[PDB]
Coordinates of C-alpha atoms in Angstrom, one line a residue:
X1 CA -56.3 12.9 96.6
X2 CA -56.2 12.2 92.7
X3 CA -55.6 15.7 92.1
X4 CA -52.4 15.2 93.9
X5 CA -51.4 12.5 92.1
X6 CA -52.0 14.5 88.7
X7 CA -50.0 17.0 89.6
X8 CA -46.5 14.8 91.1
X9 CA -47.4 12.6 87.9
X10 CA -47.0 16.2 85.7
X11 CA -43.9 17.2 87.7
X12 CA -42.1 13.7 87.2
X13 CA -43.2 14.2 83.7
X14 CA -41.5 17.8 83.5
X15 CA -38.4 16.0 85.6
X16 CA -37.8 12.7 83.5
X17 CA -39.1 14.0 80.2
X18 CA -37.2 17.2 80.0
X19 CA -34.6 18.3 77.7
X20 CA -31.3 17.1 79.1
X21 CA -28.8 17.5 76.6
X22 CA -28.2 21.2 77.0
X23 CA -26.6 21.6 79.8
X24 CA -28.6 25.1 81.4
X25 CA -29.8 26.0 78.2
X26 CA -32.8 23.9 77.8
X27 CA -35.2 23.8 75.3
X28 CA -38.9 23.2 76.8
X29 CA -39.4 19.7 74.6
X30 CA -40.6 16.5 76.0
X31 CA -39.6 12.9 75.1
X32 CA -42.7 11.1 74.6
X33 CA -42.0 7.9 76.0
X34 CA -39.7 7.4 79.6
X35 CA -38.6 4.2 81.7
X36 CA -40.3 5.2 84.5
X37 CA -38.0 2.8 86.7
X38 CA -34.5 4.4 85.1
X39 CA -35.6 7.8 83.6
X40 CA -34.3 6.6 80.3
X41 CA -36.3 8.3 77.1
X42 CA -37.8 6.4 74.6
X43 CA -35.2 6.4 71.4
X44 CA -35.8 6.0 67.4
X45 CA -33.1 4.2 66.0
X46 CA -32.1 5.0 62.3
X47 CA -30.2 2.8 59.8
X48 CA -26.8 3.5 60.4
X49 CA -27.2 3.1 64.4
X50 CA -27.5 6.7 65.4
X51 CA -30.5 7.4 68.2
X52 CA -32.8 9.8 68.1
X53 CA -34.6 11.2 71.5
X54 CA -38.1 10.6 70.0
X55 CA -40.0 14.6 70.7
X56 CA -43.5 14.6 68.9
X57 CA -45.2 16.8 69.2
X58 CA -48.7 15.4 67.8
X59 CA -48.0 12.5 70.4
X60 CA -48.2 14.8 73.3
X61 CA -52.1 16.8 72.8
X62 CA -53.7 15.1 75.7
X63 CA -50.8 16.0 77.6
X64 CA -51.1 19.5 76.9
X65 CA -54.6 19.0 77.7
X66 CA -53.5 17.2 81.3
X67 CA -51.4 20.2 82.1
X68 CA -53.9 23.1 81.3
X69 CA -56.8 21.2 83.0
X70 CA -54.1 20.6 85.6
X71 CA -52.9 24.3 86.3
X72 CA -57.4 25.3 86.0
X73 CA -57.7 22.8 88.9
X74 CA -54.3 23.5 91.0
X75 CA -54.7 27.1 90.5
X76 CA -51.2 26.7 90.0
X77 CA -50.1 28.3 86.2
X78 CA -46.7 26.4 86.0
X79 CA -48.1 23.8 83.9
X80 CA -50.4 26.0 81.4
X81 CA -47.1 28.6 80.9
X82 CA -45.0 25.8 80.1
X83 CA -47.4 24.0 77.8
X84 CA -47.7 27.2 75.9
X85 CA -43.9 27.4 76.1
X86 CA -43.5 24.2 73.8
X87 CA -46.3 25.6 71.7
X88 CA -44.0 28.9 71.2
X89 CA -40.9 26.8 71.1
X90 CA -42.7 24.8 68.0
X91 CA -44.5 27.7 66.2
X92 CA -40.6 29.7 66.4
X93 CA -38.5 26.7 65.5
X94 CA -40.6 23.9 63.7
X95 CA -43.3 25.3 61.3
X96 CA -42.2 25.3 57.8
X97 CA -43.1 28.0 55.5
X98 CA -46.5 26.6 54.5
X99 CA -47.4 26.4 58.0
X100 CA -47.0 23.0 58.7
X101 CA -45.7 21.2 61.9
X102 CA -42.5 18.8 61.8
X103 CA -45.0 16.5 63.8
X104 CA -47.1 13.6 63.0
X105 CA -46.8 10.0 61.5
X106 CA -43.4 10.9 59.8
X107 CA -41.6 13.8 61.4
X108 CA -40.5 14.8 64.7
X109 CA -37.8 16.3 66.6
X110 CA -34.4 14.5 68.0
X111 CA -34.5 16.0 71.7
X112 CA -30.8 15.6 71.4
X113 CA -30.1 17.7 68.7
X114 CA -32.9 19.8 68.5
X115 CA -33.1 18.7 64.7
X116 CA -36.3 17.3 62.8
X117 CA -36.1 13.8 62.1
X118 CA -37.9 12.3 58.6
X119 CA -38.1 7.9 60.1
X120 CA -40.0 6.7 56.7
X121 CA -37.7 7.0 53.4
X122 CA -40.5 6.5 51.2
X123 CA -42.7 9.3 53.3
X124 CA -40.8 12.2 54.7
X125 CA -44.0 14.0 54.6
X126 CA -46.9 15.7 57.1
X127 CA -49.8 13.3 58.3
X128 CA -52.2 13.4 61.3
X129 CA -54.3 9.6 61.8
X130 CA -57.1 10.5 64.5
X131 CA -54.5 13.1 66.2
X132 CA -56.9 16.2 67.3
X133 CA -54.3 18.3 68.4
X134 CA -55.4 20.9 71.1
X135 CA -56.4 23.9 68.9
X136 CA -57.8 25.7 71.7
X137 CA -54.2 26.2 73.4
X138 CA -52.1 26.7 70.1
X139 CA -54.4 30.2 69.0
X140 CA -54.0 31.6 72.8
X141 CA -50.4 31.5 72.1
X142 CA -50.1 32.7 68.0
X143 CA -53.7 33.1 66.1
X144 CA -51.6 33.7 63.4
X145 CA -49.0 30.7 63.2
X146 CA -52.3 28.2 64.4
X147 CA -54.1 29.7 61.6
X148 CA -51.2 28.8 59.3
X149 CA -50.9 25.6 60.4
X150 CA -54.6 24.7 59.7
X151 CA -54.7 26.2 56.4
X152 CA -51.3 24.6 55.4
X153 CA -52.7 21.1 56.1
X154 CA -55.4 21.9 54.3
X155 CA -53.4 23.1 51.2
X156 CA -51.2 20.2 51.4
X157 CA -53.5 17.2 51.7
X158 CA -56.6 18.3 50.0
X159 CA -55.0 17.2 46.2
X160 CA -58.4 18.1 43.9
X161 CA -60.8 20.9 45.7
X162 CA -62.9 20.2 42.5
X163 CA -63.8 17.0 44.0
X164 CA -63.0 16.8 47.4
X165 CA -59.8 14.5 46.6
X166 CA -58.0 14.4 50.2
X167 CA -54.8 12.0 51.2
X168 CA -52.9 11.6 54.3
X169 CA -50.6 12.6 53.2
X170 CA -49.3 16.4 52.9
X171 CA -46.1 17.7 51.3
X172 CA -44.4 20.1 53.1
X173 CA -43.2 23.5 51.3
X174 CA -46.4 23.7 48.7
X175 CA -47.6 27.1 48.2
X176 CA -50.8 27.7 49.1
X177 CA -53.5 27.2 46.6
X178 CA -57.3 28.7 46.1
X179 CA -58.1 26.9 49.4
X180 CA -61.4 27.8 50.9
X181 CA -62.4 29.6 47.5
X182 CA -62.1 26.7 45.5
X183 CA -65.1 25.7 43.4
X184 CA -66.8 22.5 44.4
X185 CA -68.5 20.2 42.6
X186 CA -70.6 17.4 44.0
X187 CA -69.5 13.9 42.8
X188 CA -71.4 10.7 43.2
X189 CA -70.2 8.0 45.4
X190 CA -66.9 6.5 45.5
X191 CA -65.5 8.4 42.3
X192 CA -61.9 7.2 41.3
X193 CA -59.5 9.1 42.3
X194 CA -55.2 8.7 43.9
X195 CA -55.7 10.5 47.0
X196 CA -57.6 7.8 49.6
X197 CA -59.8 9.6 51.4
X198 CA -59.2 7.3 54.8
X199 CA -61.3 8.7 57.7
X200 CA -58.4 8.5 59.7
X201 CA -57.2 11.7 58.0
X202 CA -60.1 13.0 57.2
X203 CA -61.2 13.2 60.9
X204 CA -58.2 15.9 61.3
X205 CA -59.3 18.3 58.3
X206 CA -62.7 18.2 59.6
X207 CA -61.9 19.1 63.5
X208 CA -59.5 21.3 62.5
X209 CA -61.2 23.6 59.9
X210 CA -64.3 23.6 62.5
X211 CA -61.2 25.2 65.4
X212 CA -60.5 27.8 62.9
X213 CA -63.7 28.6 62.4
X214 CA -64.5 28.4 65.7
X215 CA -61.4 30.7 66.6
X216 CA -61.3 32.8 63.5
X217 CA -64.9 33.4 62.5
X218 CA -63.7 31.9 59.1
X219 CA -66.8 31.2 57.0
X220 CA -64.7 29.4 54.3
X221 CA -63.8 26.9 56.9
X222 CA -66.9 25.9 58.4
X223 CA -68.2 25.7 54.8
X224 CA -65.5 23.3 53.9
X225 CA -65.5 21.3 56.8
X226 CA -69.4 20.2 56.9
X227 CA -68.7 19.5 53.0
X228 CA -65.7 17.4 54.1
X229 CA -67.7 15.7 57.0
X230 CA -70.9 15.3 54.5
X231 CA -69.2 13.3 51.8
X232 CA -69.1 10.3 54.4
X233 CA -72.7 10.6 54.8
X234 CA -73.9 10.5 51.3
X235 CA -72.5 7.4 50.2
X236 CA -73.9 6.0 53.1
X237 CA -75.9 2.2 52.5
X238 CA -79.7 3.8 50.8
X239 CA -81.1 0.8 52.5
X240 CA -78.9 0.3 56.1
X241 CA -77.3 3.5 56.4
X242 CA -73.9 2.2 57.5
X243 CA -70.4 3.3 56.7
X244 CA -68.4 5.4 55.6
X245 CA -64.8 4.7 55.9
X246 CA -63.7 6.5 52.7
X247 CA -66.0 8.3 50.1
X248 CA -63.9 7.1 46.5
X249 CA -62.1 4.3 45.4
X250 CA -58.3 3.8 44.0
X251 CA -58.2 4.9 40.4
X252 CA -56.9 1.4 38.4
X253 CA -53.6 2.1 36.8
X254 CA -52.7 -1.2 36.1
X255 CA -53.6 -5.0 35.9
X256 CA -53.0 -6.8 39.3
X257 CA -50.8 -10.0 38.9
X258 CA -50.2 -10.8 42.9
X259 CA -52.9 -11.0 45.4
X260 CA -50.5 -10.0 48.2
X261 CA -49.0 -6.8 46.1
X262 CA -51.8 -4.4 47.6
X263 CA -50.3 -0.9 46.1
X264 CA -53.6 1.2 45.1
X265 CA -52.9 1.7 41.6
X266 CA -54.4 -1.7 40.9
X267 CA -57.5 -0.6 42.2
X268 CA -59.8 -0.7 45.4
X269 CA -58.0 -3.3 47.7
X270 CA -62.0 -4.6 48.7
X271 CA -62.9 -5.2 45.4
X272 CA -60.0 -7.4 44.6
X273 CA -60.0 -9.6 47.5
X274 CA -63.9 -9.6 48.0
X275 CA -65.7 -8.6 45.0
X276 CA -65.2 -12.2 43.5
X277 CA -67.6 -13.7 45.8
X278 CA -69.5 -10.5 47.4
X279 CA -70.0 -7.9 44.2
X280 CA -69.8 -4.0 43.1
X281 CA -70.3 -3.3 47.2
X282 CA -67.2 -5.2 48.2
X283 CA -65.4 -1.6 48.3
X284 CA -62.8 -0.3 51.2
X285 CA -65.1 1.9 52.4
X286 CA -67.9 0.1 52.3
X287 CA -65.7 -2.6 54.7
X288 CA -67.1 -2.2 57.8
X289 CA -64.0 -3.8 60.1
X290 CA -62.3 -3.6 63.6
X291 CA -60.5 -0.6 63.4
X292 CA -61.8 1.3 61.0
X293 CA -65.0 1.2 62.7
X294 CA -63.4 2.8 65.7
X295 CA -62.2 5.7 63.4
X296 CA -66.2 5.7 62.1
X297 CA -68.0 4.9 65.4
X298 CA -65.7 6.2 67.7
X299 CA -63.1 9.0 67.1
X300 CA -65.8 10.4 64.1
X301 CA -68.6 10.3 66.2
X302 CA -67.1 11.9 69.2
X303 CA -65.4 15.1 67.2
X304 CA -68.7 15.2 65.4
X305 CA -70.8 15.3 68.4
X306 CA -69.1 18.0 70.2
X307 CA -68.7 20.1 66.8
X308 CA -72.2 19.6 66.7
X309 CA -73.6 20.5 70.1
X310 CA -70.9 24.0 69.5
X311 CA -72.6 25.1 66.3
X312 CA -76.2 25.3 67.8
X313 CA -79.0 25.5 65.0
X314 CA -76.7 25.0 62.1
X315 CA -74.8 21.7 63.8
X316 CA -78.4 19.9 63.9
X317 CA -77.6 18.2 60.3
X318 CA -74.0 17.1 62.2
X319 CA -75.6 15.5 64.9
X320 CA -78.2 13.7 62.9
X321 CA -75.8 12.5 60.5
X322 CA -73.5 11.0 63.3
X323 CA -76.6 9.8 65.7
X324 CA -78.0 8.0 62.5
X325 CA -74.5 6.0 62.2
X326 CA -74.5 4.8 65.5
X327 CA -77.9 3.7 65.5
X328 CA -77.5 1.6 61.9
X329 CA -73.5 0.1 63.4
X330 CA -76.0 -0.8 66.6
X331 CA -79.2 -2.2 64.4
X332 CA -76.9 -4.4 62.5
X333 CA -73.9 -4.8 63.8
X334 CA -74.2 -5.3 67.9
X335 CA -74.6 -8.9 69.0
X336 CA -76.3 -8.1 72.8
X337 CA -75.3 -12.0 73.6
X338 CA -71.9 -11.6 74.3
X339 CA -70.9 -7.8 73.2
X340 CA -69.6 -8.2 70.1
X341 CA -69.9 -6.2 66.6
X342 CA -69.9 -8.4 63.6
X343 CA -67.1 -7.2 60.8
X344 CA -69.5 -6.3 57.5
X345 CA -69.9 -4.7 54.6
X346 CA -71.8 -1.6 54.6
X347 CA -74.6 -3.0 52.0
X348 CA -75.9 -5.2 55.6
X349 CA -73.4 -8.4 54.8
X350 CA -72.3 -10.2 58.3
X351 CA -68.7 -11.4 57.9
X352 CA -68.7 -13.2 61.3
X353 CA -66.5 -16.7 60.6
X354 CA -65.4 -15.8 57.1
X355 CA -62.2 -17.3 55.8
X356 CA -60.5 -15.0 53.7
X357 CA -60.2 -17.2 50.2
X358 CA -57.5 -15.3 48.9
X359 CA -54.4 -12.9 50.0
X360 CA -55.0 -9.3 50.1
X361 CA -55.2 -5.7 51.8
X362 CA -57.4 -7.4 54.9
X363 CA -55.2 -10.7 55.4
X364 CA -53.8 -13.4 53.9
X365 CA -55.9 -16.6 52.7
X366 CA -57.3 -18.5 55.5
X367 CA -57.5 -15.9 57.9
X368 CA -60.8 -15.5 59.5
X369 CA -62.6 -12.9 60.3
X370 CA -64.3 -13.2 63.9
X371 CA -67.0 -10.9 65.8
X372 CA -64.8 -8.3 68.1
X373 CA -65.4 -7.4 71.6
X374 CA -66.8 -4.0 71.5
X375 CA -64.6 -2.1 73.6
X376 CA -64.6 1.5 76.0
X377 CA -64.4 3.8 73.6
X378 CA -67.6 2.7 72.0
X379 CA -69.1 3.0 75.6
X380 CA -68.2 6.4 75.8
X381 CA -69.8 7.5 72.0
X382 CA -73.0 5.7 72.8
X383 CA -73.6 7.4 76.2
X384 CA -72.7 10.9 74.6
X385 CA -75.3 9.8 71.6
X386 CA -77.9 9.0 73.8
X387 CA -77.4 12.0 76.1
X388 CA -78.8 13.9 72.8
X389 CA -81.0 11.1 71.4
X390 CA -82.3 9.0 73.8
X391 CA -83.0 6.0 71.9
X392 CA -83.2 2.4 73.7
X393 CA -81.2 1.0 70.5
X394 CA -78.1 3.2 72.0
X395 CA -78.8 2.8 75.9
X396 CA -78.7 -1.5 74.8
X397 CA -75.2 -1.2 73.3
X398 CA -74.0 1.1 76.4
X399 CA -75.5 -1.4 78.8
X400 CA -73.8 -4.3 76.9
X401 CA -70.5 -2.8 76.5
X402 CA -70.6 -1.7 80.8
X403 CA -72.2 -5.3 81.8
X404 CA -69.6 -6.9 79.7
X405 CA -66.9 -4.7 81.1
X406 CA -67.5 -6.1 84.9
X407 CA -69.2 -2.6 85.5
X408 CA -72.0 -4.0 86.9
X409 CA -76.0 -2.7 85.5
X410 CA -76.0 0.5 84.1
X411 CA -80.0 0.2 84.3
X412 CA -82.7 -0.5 81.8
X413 CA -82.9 3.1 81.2
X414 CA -80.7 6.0 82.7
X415 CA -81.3 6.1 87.1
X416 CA -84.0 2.9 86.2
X417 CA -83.0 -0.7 88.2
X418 CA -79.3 0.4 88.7
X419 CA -77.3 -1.5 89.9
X420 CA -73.3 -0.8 89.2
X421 CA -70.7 -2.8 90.6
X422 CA -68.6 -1.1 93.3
X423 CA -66.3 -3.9 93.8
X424 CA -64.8 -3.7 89.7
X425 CA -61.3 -3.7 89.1
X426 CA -61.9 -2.0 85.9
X427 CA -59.0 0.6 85.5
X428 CA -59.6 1.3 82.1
X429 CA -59.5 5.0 81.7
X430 CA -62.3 5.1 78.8
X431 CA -64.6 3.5 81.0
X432 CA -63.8 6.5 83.4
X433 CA -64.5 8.9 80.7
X434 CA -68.0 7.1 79.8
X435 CA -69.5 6.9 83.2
X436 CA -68.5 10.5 83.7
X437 CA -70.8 11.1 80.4
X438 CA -73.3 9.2 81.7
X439 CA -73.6 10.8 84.8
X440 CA -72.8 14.4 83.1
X441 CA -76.5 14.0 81.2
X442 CA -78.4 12.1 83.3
X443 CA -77.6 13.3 86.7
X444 CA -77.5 10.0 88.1
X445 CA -75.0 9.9 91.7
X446 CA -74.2 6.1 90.9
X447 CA -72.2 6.5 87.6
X448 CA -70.0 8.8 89.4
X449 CA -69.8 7.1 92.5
X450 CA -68.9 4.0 89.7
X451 CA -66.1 6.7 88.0
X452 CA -64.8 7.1 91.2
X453 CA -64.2 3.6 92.2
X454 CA -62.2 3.2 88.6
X455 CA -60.1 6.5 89.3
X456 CA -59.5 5.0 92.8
X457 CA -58.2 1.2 90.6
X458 CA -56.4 3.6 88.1
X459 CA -54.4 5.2 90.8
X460 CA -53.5 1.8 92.8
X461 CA -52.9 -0.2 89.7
X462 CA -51.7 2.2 86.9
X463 CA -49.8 4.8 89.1
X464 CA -46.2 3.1 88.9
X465 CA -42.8 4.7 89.5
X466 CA -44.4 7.9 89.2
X467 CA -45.7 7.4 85.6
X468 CA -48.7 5.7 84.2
X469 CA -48.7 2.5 82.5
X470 CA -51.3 0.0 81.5
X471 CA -49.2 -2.9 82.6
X472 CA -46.3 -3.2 85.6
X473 CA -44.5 -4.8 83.2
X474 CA -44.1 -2.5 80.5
X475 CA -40.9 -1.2 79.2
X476 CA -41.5 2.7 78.8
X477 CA -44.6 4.9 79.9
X478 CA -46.5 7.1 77.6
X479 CA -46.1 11.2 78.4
X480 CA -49.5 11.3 76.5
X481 CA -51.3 8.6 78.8
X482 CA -54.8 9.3 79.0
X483 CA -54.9 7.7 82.8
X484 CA -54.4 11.6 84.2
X485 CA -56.9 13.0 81.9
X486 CA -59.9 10.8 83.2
X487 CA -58.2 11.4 86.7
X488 CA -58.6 15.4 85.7
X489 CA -62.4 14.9 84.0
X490 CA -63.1 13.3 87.7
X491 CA -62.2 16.1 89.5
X492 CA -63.6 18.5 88.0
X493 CA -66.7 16.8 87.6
X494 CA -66.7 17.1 91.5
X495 CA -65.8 20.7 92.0
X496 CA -68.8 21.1 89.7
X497 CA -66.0 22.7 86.8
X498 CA -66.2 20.4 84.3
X499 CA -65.3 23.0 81.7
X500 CA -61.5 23.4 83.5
X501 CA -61.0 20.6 81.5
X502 CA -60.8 20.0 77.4
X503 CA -63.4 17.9 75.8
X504 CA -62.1 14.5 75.3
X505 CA -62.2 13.3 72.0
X506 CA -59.7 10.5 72.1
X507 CA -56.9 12.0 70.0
X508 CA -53.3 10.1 69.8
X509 CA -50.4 10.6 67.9
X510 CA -47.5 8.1 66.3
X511 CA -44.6 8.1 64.8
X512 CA -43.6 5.3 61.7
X513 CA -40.7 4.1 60.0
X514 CA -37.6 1.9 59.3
X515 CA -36.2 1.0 62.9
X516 CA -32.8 -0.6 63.2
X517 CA -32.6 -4.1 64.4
X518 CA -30.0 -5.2 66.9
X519 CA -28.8 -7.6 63.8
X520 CA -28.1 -4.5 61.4
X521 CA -31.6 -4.6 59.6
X522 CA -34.4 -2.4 58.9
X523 CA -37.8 -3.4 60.5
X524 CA -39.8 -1.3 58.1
X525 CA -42.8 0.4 59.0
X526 CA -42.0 0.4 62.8
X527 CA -44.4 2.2 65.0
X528 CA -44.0 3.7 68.2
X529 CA -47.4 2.1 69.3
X530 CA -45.4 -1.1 68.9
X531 CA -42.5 0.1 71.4
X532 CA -44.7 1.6 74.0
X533 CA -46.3 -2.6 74.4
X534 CA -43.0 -4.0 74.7
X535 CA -42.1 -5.5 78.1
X536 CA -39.4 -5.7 80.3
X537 CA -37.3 -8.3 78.2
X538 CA -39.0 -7.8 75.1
X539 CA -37.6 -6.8 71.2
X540 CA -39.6 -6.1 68.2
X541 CA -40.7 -9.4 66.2
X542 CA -40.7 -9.4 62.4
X543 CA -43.8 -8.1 60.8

């Protein structure tokens, strides 16, 4: 019974995970990662040797979103109160005066000491990267502080209103500003500006001024959050309508003299290390490469999607706008051969095979840049495109991506020729999440009956010492897996409920910094990503 196994996963997580260094006076904070084999928790080591129990907070939103779906499906509230326990434990004792969280890429709490931690030197600041922290419980437990927060990060990492001038960055203690009354003034594409307007970032002012809207009624938000999301659609190819990663360029401060020295103040990082041979289109976000084309085509599209299908009449321009993307990255980008997207630039250029000619922001010289498998989480924005636009163009990358992932025939069209395969070891839990979507729109028994077999290979593969992991092997197990959550979306797709459980939108936090090295040094810009795909035996290797 998966539901079952969700709910002992949950309590080992409250078990191992918990606040231990309080005797009977326990806070209600998590360690995000734990040995599932010893119970140990997952540690940040600073530069003088001291270890920090690493608690963040914007590392544990699908867990939040396990435990509510959990307690909606038990019936049992033990889970919900205590996730809204660590939301009232953060909102009392970690929101700084402008509203912002000690959470995200730079800050977090020491589960030892209960003190916030600041890991990058350079960058003891606020930043969410593709986190889409779960809104939805945060106002049922303070309106007012989740309000705060949302305007805060606003305030902080919106640098010129004028212009739309955003950064990843957000300085905490700012006071607030004009904010939502700001005037605006429409610039053309890829202005020059400091702040880089990365997606990444971006995605979390958008989904988060569309929750306080949502929550709030806020007019001001809404308006500045289909601004935000629209100035990556109007610099947008004329002629192929890809990109956009970012929607301006780094003002040029100063006159490059090494390749490899990347800082922004030289100017756009494409440009130097592509407009030589490629011209004025070789800009970053114009560069249309693994990674940040997951942040475009995947965590973009699937926020956008759902923010669109919630506005009704006035999300139809939201939905269009992210369709439209899919359907150019598809047109020019999907290889059907083998399942690949080719890197480009947005203008239509392929970049399969090229050999970087010179060091820069995308590689040193020599490296080459080679189609990339297209993954689940492209399965899963391409079945929730079509659902609303059923275009062949978006059913042929959705096939590709399923045949290629041992899934067996999705069909020539949705319920046409299927023919799935029920003996896949797939235990990935995106490809849960997509055939769920897929069988959520189209009604169609064998995509669940698919979703199934893949909860059932999650379980016997991924269920180990009580924890998840995507590998026996692996040192420490991830509180924030998303194995329980496509577990969860499966059972209440069954008990016909699927609103028990939050929309996925494949949110995840990290945490950066210096990390100490067993020989005294500081591996700089250390991420917990990096920690959580160590095995058993395993140390960080220089980078």
């Amino acid at each position: 019974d998966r539901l079952t196994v969700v709910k002992q996963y949950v309590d080992n997580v409250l078990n191992k995970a918990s606040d231990t260094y309080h005797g009977d006076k326990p806070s209600p904070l998590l360690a995000d990662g734990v040995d599932p084999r010893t119970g140990q928790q997952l540690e940040w080591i600073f530069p003088d040797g001291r270890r920090a129990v690493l608690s963040n907070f914007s590392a544990q939103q699908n867990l939040m979103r396990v435990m509510s779906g959990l307690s909606q499906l038990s019936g049992d509230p033990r889970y919900q109160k205590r996730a809204e326990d660590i939301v009232r434990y953060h909102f009392q004792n970690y929101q700084d005066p402008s509203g912002l969280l000690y959470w995200g890429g730079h800050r977090f709490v020491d589960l030892k000491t209960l003190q916030p931690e600041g890991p990058s030197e350079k960058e003891m600041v606020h930043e969410l990267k593709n986190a889409y922290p779960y809104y939805d419980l945060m106002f049922s437990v303070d309106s007012d502080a989740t309000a705060r927060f949302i305007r805060g990060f606003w305030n902080a990492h919106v640098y010129d209103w004028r212009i739309l001038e955003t950064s990843r960055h957000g300085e905490y203690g700012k006071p607030m500003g004009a904010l939502w009354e700001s005037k605006f003034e429409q610039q053309p594409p890829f202005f020059a500006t400091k702040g880089l307007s990365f997606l990444n970032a971006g995605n979390d002012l958008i989904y988060s001024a569309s929750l306080l809207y949502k929550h709030q009624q806020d007019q001001g938000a809404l308006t500045w959050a289909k601004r935000l999301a629209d100035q990556y659609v109007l610099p947008r190819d004329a002629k192929t309508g890809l990109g956009v990663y970012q929607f301006t360029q780094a003002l040029k401060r100063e006159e490059p003299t090494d390749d490899a020295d990347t800082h922004s103040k030289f100017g756009d990082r494409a440009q130097r290390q592509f407009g030589p041979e490629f011209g004025p289109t070789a800009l970053e976000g114009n560069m249309m490469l693994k990674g940040r084309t997951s942040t475009l085509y995947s965590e973009n599209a699937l926020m956008q999607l759902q923010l669109g299908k919630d506005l009704g009449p006035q999300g139809q321009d939201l939905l269009k706008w992210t369709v439209d993307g899919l359907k150019a990255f598809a047109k020019y980008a999907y290889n059907d051969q083998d399942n690949t997207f080719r890197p480009m630039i947005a203008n239509g250029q392929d970049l399969s095979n090229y050999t970087l000619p010179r060091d820069g922001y995308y590689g040193k010289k020599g490296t080459v840049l080679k189609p990339y498998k297209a993954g689940n989480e492209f399965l899963i924005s391409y079945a929730r495109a079509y659902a609303i636009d059923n275009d062949p163009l978006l059913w042929k990358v959705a096939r590709g991506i399923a045949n290629d992932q041992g899934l067996g025939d999705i069909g020539t069209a949705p319920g046409k020729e299927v023919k799935v395969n029920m003996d896949t070891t797939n235990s990935d839990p995106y490809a849960l999440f997509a055939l769920l979507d897929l069988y959520h729109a189209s009604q169609v028994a064998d995509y669940r009956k698919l979703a199934e077999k893949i909860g059932d290979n999650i379980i016997k593969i991924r269920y180990i010492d009580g924890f998840f992991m995507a590998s026996s092997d692996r040192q420490y197990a991830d509180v924030d897996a998303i194995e329980p959550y496509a577990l969860l979306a499966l059972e209440a797709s069954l008990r016909n409920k699927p609103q028990a459980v939050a929309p996925f939108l494949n949110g995840a936090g990290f945490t950066e910094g210096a990390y100490r090295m067993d020989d005294g040094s500081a591996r700089v810009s250390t991420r917990d990503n990096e920690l959580f795909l160590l095995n058993v035996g395993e140390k960080l290797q220089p980078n």
